[PDB]
Design a protein around this nucleic acid. Structure first.
Length: 91
RNA sequence: GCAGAUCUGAGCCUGGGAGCUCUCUGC
C-alpha cells in the first residue's frame, strides 16, 4: 500500500555506479521536477540498486514518478514507486 | 547514541531482496 507523498522509491538502479555519482546523477535528473530535500542510497549487505528521493513538494514526486517511470538511467529502466513511508523529516 | 563504510569488511535471513545483526571509521 502506497499513496502520494514527498518520497519516491527507485529500484532496478545500476549497482555498478559509485554511490556518490549515483546521488549526483539522480539529483541532476530529478531536480527538474522540483526542489529535492535529500537523496538516500541505503547501505545493504550486497548492492541492490535502491534509492529514495525526497522532494520538498508532493506534486514534484507525483510528476517525477509519472515522467521517469521505466526511463533508462545508466542503461537500466528505472522502477519507481511512492515510498511506503515518507522519509521527509518535518521537524 | 548520531553519522558514515563491503561489486573496494563480515555473518545471517530471503530464494522473484523496500529484511536482520556484526565489524570498522568519525563524533
Amino acid at each position: 500500500e502506497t499513496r502520494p507523498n514527498h518520497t519516491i522509491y527507485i529500484n532496478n538502479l545500476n549497482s555498478k555506479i559509485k554511490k556518490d555519482e549515483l546521488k549526483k546523477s539522480l539529483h541532476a535528473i530529478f531536480s527538474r521536477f522540483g526542489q529535492i530535500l535529500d537523496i538516500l542510497v541505503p547501505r545493504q549487505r550486497t548492492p541492490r540498486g535502491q534509492a529514495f528521493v525526497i522532494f520538498k513538494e508532493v506534486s514534484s514526486a507525483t510528476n517525477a514518478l509519472r515522467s521517469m517511470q521505466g526511463f533508462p538511467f545508466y542503461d537500466k529502466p528505472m522502477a519507481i514507486q511512492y515510498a511506503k513511508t515518507d522519509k521527509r523529516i518535518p521537524a
